[PDB]
Design an enzyme around this catalytic site. Structure first.
Site, PDB file in Angstrom:
ATOM      1  N   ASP A  15       0.786  -1.244   0.000  1.00 27.88           N
ATOM      2  CA  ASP A  15       0.000   0.000   0.000  1.00 27.88           C
ATOM      3  C   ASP A  15       0.814   1.289   0.000  1.00 27.88           C
ATOM      4  O   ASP A  15       0.229   2.393   0.067  1.00 27.88           O
ATOM      5  CB  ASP A  15      -0.987  -0.012   1.132  1.00 27.88           C
ATOM      6  CG  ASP A  15      -0.314  -0.124   2.480  1.00 27.88           C
ATOM      7  OD1 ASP A  15      -0.954  -0.552   3.498  1.00 27.88           O
ATOM      8  OD2 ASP A  15       0.883   0.274   2.602  1.00 27.88           O
ATOM      9  N   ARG A  29       0.904   6.820  -0.244  1.00 29.74           N
ATOM     10  CA  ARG A  29       0.240   5.796   0.509  1.00 29.74           C
ATOM     11  C   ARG A  29      -1.211   5.679   0.002  1.00 29.74           C
ATOM     12  O   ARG A  29      -1.933   6.680  -0.126  1.00 29.74           O
ATOM     13  CB  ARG A  29       0.269   6.226   2.022  1.00 29.74           C
ATOM     14  CG  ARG A  29      -0.608   5.349   2.905  1.00 29.74           C
ATOM     15  CD  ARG A  29      -0.046   3.921   2.995  1.00 29.74           C
ATOM     16  NE  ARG A  29      -0.658   3.149   4.069  1.00 29.74           N
ATOM     17  CZ  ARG A  29      -1.857   2.568   4.021  1.00 29.74           C
ATOM     18  NH1 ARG A  29      -2.624   2.668   2.910  1.00 29.74           N
ATOM     19  NH2 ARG A  29      -2.306   1.812   5.051  1.00 29.74           N
ATOM     20  N   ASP A  34      -5.608  -0.985   3.903  1.00 24.41           N
ATOM     21  CA  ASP A  34      -4.387  -1.402   4.560  1.00 24.41           C
ATOM     22  C   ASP A  34      -4.011  -2.784   4.091  1.00 24.41           C
ATOM     23  O   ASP A  34      -4.806  -3.734   4.229  1.00 24.41           O
ATOM     24  CB  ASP A  34      -4.526  -1.295   6.092  1.00 24.41           C
ATOM     25  CG  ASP A  34      -3.230  -1.553   6.819  1.00 24.41           C
ATOM     26  OD1 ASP A  34      -2.103  -1.079   6.368  1.00 24.41           O
ATOM     27  OD2 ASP A  34      -3.351  -2.101   7.954  1.00 24.41           O
ATOM     28  N   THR A  35      -2.856  -2.895   3.436  1.00 25.60           N
ATOM     29  CA  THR A  35      -2.246  -4.228   3.193  1.00 25.60           C
ATOM     30  C   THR A  35      -1.465  -4.664   4.427  1.00 25.60           C
ATOM     31  O   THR A  35      -1.028  -3.799   5.226  1.00 25.60           O
ATOM     32  CB  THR A  35      -1.341  -4.189   1.942  1.00 25.60           C
ATOM     33  OG1 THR A  35      -0.339  -3.165   2.127  1.00 25.60           O
ATOM     34  CG2 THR A  35      -2.203  -3.841   0.726  1.00 25.60           C
ATOM     35  N   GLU A  37       1.223  -5.954   7.178  1.00 26.54           N
ATOM     36  CA  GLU A  37       2.486  -5.315   7.451  1.00 26.54           C
ATOM     37  C   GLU A  37       3.598  -6.252   7.088  1.00 26.54           C
ATOM     38  O   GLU A  37       3.470  -7.459   7.279  1.00 26.54           O
ATOM     39  CB  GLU A  37       2.587  -4.943   8.950  1.00 26.54           C
ATOM     40  CG  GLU A  37       3.873  -4.246   9.333  1.00 26.54           C
ATOM     41  CD  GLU A  37       4.046  -2.907   8.650  1.00 26.54           C
ATOM     42  OE1 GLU A  37       3.074  -2.120   8.586  1.00 26.54           O
ATOM     43  OE2 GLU A  37       5.165  -2.633   8.189  1.00 26.54           O
ATOM     44  N   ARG A  78       3.658  11.413   3.347  1.00 31.02           N
ATOM     45  CA  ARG A  78       3.324  10.485   2.181  1.00 31.02           C
ATOM     46  C   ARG A  78       2.107  11.126   1.466  1.00 31.02           C
ATOM     47  O   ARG A  78       1.149  11.576   2.122  1.00 31.02           O
ATOM     48  CB  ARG A  78       2.957   9.099   2.652  1.00 31.02           C
ATOM     49  CG  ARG A  78       4.122   8.387   3.305  1.00 31.02           C
ATOM     50  CD  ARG A  78       3.781   7.015   3.806  1.00 31.02           C
ATOM     51  NE  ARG A  78       2.697   6.977   4.775  1.00 31.02           N
ATOM     52  CZ  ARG A  78       2.262   5.860   5.357  1.00 31.02           C
ATOM     53  NH1 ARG A  78       2.749   4.642   4.986  1.00 31.02           N
ATOM     54  NH2 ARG A  78       1.271   5.925   6.239  1.00 31.02           N
TER      55      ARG A  78
HETATM   56  C1  LIG Z   1      -3.938   5.558   4.685  1.00 26.93           C
HETATM   57  C2  LIG Z   1      -3.607   6.622   5.739  1.00 26.93           C
HETATM   58  C3  LIG Z   1      -2.611   6.353   6.656  1.00 26.93           C
HETATM   59  N1  LIG Z   1      -2.322   7.312   7.583  1.00 26.93           N
HETATM   60  C4  LIG Z   1      -1.404   7.038   8.644  1.00 26.93           C
HETATM   61  C5  LIG Z   1      -2.251   6.442   9.764  1.00 26.93           C
HETATM   62  C6  LIG Z   1      -1.296   5.512  10.441  1.00 26.93           C
HETATM   63  O1  LIG Z   1      -0.475   6.277  11.359  1.00 26.93           O
HETATM   64  P1  LIG Z   1       0.230   5.578  12.646  1.00 26.93           P
HETATM   65  O2  LIG Z   1       1.408   4.828  12.178  1.00 26.93           O
HETATM   66  O3  LIG Z   1       0.714   6.753  13.492  1.00 26.93           O
HETATM   67  O4  LIG Z   1      -0.846   4.743  13.242  1.00 26.93           O
HETATM   68  C7  LIG Z   1      -0.397   5.035   9.337  1.00 26.93           C
HETATM   69  C8  LIG Z   1      -0.983   3.768   8.683  1.00 26.93           C
HETATM   70  O5  LIG Z   1      -0.125   3.575   7.587  1.00 26.93           O
HETATM   71  P2  LIG Z   1       0.585   2.163   7.296  1.00 26.93           P
HETATM   72  O6  LIG Z   1      -0.633   1.246   7.249  1.00 26.93           O
HETATM   73  O7  LIG Z   1       1.589   2.429   6.216  1.00 26.93           O
HETATM   74  O8  LIG Z   1       1.366   1.842   8.583  1.00 26.93           O
HETATM   75  O9  LIG Z   1      -0.398   6.095   8.336  1.00 26.93           O
HETATM   76  C9  LIG Z   1      -2.969   8.575   7.554  1.00 26.93           C
HETATM   77  O10 LIG Z   1      -2.665   9.478   8.430  1.00 26.93           O
HETATM   78  N2  LIG Z   1      -3.922   8.841   6.652  1.00 26.93           N
HETATM   79  C10 LIG Z   1      -4.250   7.936   5.690  1.00 26.93           C
HETATM   80  O11 LIG Z   1      -5.169   8.242   4.905  1.00 26.93           O
HETATM   81 CA   LIG Z   2      -0.297  -1.298   5.750  1.00 25.00          CA
END
Ligand SMILES: Cc1cn([C@H]2C[C@H](OP(=O)(O)O)[C@@H](COP(=O)(O)O)O2)c(=O)[nH]c1=O
Ligand SMILES: [Ca+2]
EC number: 3.1.31.1
Length: 132
Positions: A15, A29, A34-35, A37, A78
């Site tokens: 993702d 992103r 969510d894919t 981890e 991102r």
């Molecule tokens: C998809 C998405 C992720 N994020 C943030 C939330 C999560 O933060 P935290 O790490 O602080 O929880 C993280 C999830 O991304 P990943 O799934 O790459 O880890 O990226 C956003 O802020 N907005 C978005 O639309």
């Molecule tokens: Ca993910």
């Protein structure tokens, strides 16, 4: 919303993708998904989801990003978008395979939420991958 061109630099995982956007390298992103981890201290289907995205975006003639109506970046800097590989949305394609879940649904960046939920519901009904 509108679609804008971008160029693949590198797929990171299911993702998250590095794209050249307006002549600047940026990490993108995928909105609303969510894919599993594979980086942070790997979950079931993470490698699968990563391979799927890599394949789908490396084979495209044309890649495009479509921001939603709110924030265009997250806290990590991102880009937040719907990404398309020859007109096919990668976010939907992962969910439709049961390789991502609909997640991180943060208003007002929820324009394709229902569309994605319908694909996830079919992946569920079909018991694919994450739903197996
Ligand atoms: C998809 C998405 C992720 N994020 C943030 C939330 C999560 O933060 P935290 O790490 O602080 O929880 C993280 C999830 O991304 P990943 O799934 O790459 O880890 O990226 C956003 O802020 N907005 C978005 O639309
Ligand atoms: Ca993910």
């Amino acid at each position: 919303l509108h679609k804008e061109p971008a160029t693949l630099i590198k797929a990171i995982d299911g993702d998250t993708i590095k794209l050249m956007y307006k002549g600047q390298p940026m990490t993108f992103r995928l909105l609303l998904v969510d894919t599993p981890e594979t980086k942070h201290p790997v979950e079931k289907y993470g490698p699968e989801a990563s391979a799927f995205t890599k394949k789908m975006i490396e084979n495209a003639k044309k890649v495009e990003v479509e921001f939603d109506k709110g924030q265009r970046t997250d806290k990590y800097g991102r880009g937040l978008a719907y990404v398309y590989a020859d007109g096919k949305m990668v976010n939907e394609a992962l969910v439709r395979q049961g390789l991502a879940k609909v997640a991180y649904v943060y208003k007002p960046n929820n324009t394709h939420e229902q569309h994605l939920r319908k694909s996830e519901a079919q992946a569920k009904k079909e018991k694919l991958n994450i739903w197996s």
